[PDB]
């Protein structure tokens, strides 16, 4: 019933945005632009061939394919932080402490979900709602997807309408599949063979291990 859309601004061109760096155990496959700011481009530890899109840097450091664009990066990072704060700021949750932070065999209707703990996803998780519906997760801890688990979209639910605001480190397990916009306050790890349809916008560092990120 409720409008929980999160404005990304210029961060909507980025598959991965970080403040403190990005690394990959190769080969990962990143479909979209990547960048970090305010850290030097030397902290982008990705091969040019892993990114189908542009690797941006705020400075003259980075690999030979990098494009220096301090203004575009700084805007994306600022927009990403505003997005995080927007997501965190929605009031009056529809769900509070669902599953006491464990989402086992769950199917979630659209709405605002809040936890004061970390959240773990030990099984596939289904989102059921139409193409206009929105979901926001407010997590005042970490987020973990167990190895192999998949976020499943039903009803017409779209990954551009799912946002996770996570106050501590995020771990996507080996071969797990994430859907949505990940607004991470801290570290994000995508373990061996994991995939994500959406974007990863971190206020610290992102680590990929032979992972796939497909941005809209």
Q: Residue 214 in contact with residue 194, Cβ under 8 Å?
A: no
* Beta partners for residue 127, in sequence order: 108, 153
The closest alpha carbon to 2, from 159, 109, 115, belongs to: 109
d(CA 134, CA 3): 7
d(CA 127, CA 122): 15
Structure tokens at 10: 């210029």
Query: Phi and psi at residue 27, in whole multiples of 5°?
Result: -95, 125
What 8-state DSSP symbol labels residue 20? S
> Which experiment gave this structure?
X-ray
Asked, as a colleague might, if the bond just before 38 is cis with ω within 30 of 0, I would say yes
Q: Residue 179 in contact with residue 151, Cβ under 8 Å?
A: yes
What 3-state class would DSSP assign to 43? Answer: helix
> DSSP for 148-187?
T-BEEEETT--GGGEEEEESS-EEEPTT-EEEEEEEESS-
Q: What is the 3-state secondary structure (H, E, C) of 63-97?
A: CCCCEECHHHHHHHHHHHHHHHHHHHHCCCCCEEC
Q: Residue 201 in contact with residue 180, Cβ under 8 Å?
A: no
Structure tokens at 149: 């688990």
**CB-count burial class (<10 Å; 0-12, 13-18, 19+) for 130:** exposed
Q: Residue 155 in contact with residue 128, Cβ under 8 Å?
A: yes
Pairing of strands 107-108, 125-128: parallel
d(CA 171, CA 191): 7
Domain limits at 149?
1-216
Pairing of strands 162-166, 188-190: unpaired
- How many domains does the chain fold into? 1
**CB-count burial class (<10 Å; 0-12, 13-18, 19+) for 31:** middle
Angstrom CA distances, 123 to 144, 146, 177, 206, stand at 11, 7, 11, 24
* Beta partners for residue 214, in sequence order: 31, 197
Q: Residue 56 in contact with residue 137, Cβ under 8 Å?
A: no
> Dihedral of CA 90/96/101/106: which sign?
negative
What 3-state class would DSSP assign to 42? Answer: helix
d(CA 132, CA 174): 31
């Amino acid at each position: 019933q409720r409008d929980l859309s999160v404005e990304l601004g210029v961060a909507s061109n980025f598959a991965i945005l970080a403040k403190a760096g990005i690394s990959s155990v190769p080969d990962s496959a990143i479909l979209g632009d990547v960048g970090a700011s305010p850290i030097t481009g030397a902290a982008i530890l990705l091969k040019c061939d892993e990114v189908t899109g542009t690797i941006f840097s705020v400075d003259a450091a980075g690999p030979a394919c990098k494009i220096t664009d301090a203004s575009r990066l700084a805007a994306a990072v600022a927009n990403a932080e505003t997005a995080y704060n927007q997501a965190a700021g929605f009031v009056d949750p529809d769900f509070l402490e669902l599953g006491a932070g464990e989402l086992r065999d769950q199917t979630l209707v659209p709405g605002l979900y809040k936890w004061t703990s970390s959240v773990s996803v030990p099984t596939d998780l289904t989102f059921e709602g139409n193409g206009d519906a929105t979901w926001v997760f407010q997590i005042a801890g970490g987020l973990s997807l167990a190895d192999g688990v998949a976020f499943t979209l039903a009803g017409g639910a779209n990954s551009t309408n799912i946002a996770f605001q996570v106050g501590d480190d995020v771990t996507v397990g080996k071969g797990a599949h994430f859907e949505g916009v990940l607004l991470a306050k801290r570290f994000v790890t995508l373990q061996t063979g994991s995939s994500l349809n959406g974007r990863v916008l971190s206020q610290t560092e992102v680590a990929l291990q032979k992972a796939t990120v497909n941005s809209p």
